[PDB]
Structures are given as C-alpha cells and as structure tokens.
Write a protein that binds this ligand. Structure first.
Ligand SMILES: CC(C)=CCC/C(C)=C/CC/C(C)=C\CO[C@H](COP(=O)(O)O)C(=O)O
Ligand SMILES: CC(C)=CCC/C(C)=C/CC/C(C)=C\CO[C@H](COP(=O)(O)O)C(=O)O
Ligand SMILES: [Mg+2]
Ligand SMILES: [Mg+2]
Lengths: 252, 253
C-alpha cells in the first residue's frame, strides 16, 4: 500500500490533461444528488471526483456508504479533502481512493501546519485494513483573501500577495519537502491568476497545482488553466437546482 | 495515550534544566560495561540526559534493548536515542528508551531525510512495542556544517552556507512555524560556528532547545557555545579513549 509514497491516484492526476474538477460537499449534497452528478463528471472527462467540506460530523457512518454510492456511479478516483481535528487527525473511510492531506503552511497553529500528519499516521492503520487504505496526497494548502471562518478553525492567515516573499518560502518548502500537490484556495475572493502562474513556474514538473474558490464560469476555469493550474475546483456553482446547465457552462 | 510527538517529560526536562555539556555514547562502538561506568559519572555531573547515538548501526533491536536497560539501571537521567532513519523502516526504536530524537534534515536533497522518515516512523507506530511503553519523540531540525561527504552520501545533506544568513533564516522560519521542539547543529569534520549558534538562539522561540555538537574536545569550547546561546553541547569522541575520565573532567570542569 503506497500510503504517503506516490501511488495510482497521484499518477493519474499527473498524467491526465489539466481541467476542471467538481467538488461535492457530502455534508450538504444528498447522496442521491451526488450519484447523479458523479455520472455526469465521468462523461465530461474530469480526472477525479473530490468529496470535501470544511464542516463534518459522524464522518465514518456518513462517508463510508457515501463513498461507496459515488464509486458505484463513476470509475474516477474518489478523493477526500477535510480538515483534521486534534485527537483524531484527518478523517478517513475505507473505500476512498485517496485522502488529500493539507499542510496549512500559513497557519499560526503548528498542528494545522503539519502535526496533524503525525497524528494521522500514528493512528494508521486503525480500523481499516492496511491493504485497503486510501493513498495520501501530501499537499501544501494555502488560503487567500479575508477568511475568518478558516482562520478561526484552522489558524490560517491570508497569504500576502504584496510581494513574493511569503509565497517563495512556501515554494522552497514545497520543493524541498517533496510535496505532491499545492492547493491554492480562496473562500471569499479569488486566488489571483498571477499567483497561480508564480506557483506553476516555481514548482517541479510532477507537482500538481489545484486552485479553487468561487469558480463559477468556464471563463474562470480557462483563465486559471492558462495561468498554469493543473486542476480548477468548483463546488458551490452546482449546489442549486439548475446544476446541469451550470456544469455544462463551466466544463464547456 | 503516549505523548509521542507531543511534548512530554523528556522535553520538559531539557527545557528547564541548566544548560551544559551532554555526553553522547555511541552504543555500537562503546562496550556496555564502559557505557555503564560513564553513565554513573554523568549522573554525578548533573547532565540533563544521556544520548546514545551513532551514524552506523546493525541488529538495532537485539543490541539496543539490553544496552538501554543497562544504561537505565545505572543512571536516572533520561536516555535519548539519536540515529538516522532507513527507508522501509523509518527511525530505529527499542522499548526502554525515554525518547527518540527525530532529525528533520532540512538541508538534505532527499525528501525522505528532510521529513518523510517521520511519516514512515509514525505509520509503523506502535509496531512491536506497547503504546504505553513507547518513547517520547523530540521533533528536531537537524543541520550539518562543514565538508562532510559521509553524511552527504548517506543522508543527502549539503553543508549549510554561512556566506549569508539566507539559508539559516529559511530554516528558522520552518523551525518556528512548524513548532519544532529542538534544533541540532552538527559538524562531523569541523566546528559549527559560534556566530551561527548565536543567530539560531536569537531567532528561535524561548522553549525551543538548541543543541550543538561535533568535535567538542575542551571545556573552552563548551563555554563558548553556551555563551553563544546553545542549551546543550554534545560530545562523543573526546571520551572514546582510555583516559576518558580526565577528558570528561576537562570538558565538564
Ligand atoms: C484551507 C484548505 C485549502 C484546506 C484545509 C482543509 C479544508 C478546509 C478542506 C475543505 C475543502 C476546501 C478547501 C474548501 C471548501 O470549498 C472549496 C470549493 O469552493 P467553492 O464552493 O467556492 O467552489 C473546495 O472544496 O475547494
Ligand atoms: C546529521 C544529523 C545531525 C542527524 C541525522 C542522524 C544521525 C547521523 C545521528 C548520529 C548522531 C550524530 C548527529 C553525529 C555523530 O556524533 C556526534 C558527536 O560528534 P563528536 O564525536 O565529534 O563529539 C553526535 O552524536 O552529536
Ligand atoms: Mg461544508
Ligand atoms: Mg501508525
């Protein structure tokens, strides 16, 4: 089992062509809706299906069968992305293909910078057989713009874009530490395309670059891909009744 | 649950104890009877801990379990293990040790030695040892100074450049932001510069413990490093000779 070493999911993400990736928030989207959506993501040619949320409760009982339902609807890898909690580490269920592990390098709390990784691995393998564990995508996770919700929960401070001083320290770490991916997110604003370009230029060729937050149009997805993003994530745009139209436009 | 990666009794002792020299016993070179004699003297000198460390090791578990037990029966000081990790295994460990010092080699060109060894070690935990009996882990930034192809070939390290403070300032930002417990400045063939020790002491938080070692063979050197801000000054080789009692008295007196 690869665990923290590169595996099948990371290989797929590295080799697939860049594009949009829909993120289903499993604690807001009913499982029947997730299944309907998952069937469409496959036809569009997305690289993976992310299940992600800032908030979660009764994770294992909700997510094991949620992941199973989604996996019965799409052959794409199902990747989980959730924040860790002291005393538990990151949440995990059998059946997920991978867990995206965010090292929040901009956080003022060392547990969220990386000690959560130590707690998670200490607890491994736990209740899930070693051979059945998801792979781990080690990721540098950075936040942009005013965001007191993530700041209060995880201790993050928005990355300064007044100069490249802070981001260059994060690129040195991403490279020296051999992170698999970088995830640039903005809860309330937009990650600047020029920051995406700076990261693409500074990262190694096998490091995968995700950008998400308030992406709601195909124009935005194109602009981020043109700026160097490997994957452009979007959740909220499809959390409405007319999601099929929205999905077509964003993926068009 | 064992503290493991969280601060525990050993880190508290290192943070609160008076700064001073710390003798490092290489257990794969020093006979256990001699280690036991040495441990008794270290206790009399009031050192903060006894470190057992080596770059080289084989048959770790069968050798170290009884070695650690012998040393523990001879001193009440915490016994801390410090050895490099090996891919496929992570860091070596035996029951009975009070703590393992875990070096994150931030200057290595190999990400396994920069930090993934930590992930492998914790993934393997608890393994063959009962959770409640596991040693505490001291998360440490480990940096190397001076020409050192042995560590370079083994662990991927590149000597820290001191022609500017750019490289060490980057390590200090990591040490602080990642909440490392300790920083270990080592020179296999030269001497860590006292001015680098001062830069690290001024740049670290008050609870971060600063160790310096490598080629310390005199009390004058220990004093200079302590004056520069080191919390502990390690020395192994100076006592690897017959007249070690005189050498110890000069380094500690
Ligand atoms: C802070 C961080 C990067 C990681 C820590 C773990 C953490 C909080 C994981 C949850 C996923 C996340 C970063 C944001 C939630 O929604 C956005 C889609 O935004 P939109 O609805 O605007 O499309 C997404 O899933 O990307
Ligand atoms: C490179 C590094 C810092 C950590 C990786 C793990 C690693 C190689 C651990 C072994 C311990 C070590 C750093 C050096 C060996 O001897 C000196 C004392 O030298 P002296 O005989 O000159 O007194 C010591 O133990 O400190
Ligand atoms: Mg949510
Ligand atoms: Mg474990």
């Amino acid at each position: 089992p690869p665990l923290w070493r590169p595996g099948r999911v990371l290989a797929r993400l590295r080799e697939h062509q860049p594009g949009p990736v829909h993120i289903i928030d499993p604690f807001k989207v009913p499982v029947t809706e997730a299944v309907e959506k998952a069937a469409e993501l496959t036809r569009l040619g997305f690289a993976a299906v992310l299940l992600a949320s800032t908030d979660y409760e009764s994770f294992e009982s909700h997510m094991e069968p949620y992941v199973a339902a989604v996996k019965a609807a799409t052959p794409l890898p199902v990747v989980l992305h959730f924040p860790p909690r002291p005393g538990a580490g990151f949440p995990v269920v059998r059946g997920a293909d991978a867990l995206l592990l965010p090292a929040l390098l901009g956080s003022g709390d060392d547990y969220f910078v990386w000690k959560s990784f130590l707690e998670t691995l200490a607890a491994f393998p736990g209740r899930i057989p070693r051979e059945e564990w998801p792979e781990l995508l080690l990721t540098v996770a950075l936040t942009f713009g005013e965001d007191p919700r993530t700041g209060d929960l995880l201790g993050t401070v928005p990355v300064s874009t007044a100069s490249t001083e802070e981001i260059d320290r994060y690129l040195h770490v991403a490279r020296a530490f051999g992170f698999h991916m970088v995830y640039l997110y903005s809860r309330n604003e937009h990650v600047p395309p020029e920051v995406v370009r700076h990261f693409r230029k500074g990262l190694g060729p096998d490091q995968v670059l995700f950008v998400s937050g308030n992406v709601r149009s195909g124009r935005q997805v194109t602009e981020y891909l043109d700026s160097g993003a490997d994957y452009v994530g979007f959740a909220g745009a499809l959390e409405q009744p007319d999601w099929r139209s929205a999905l077509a436009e964003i993926a068009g």
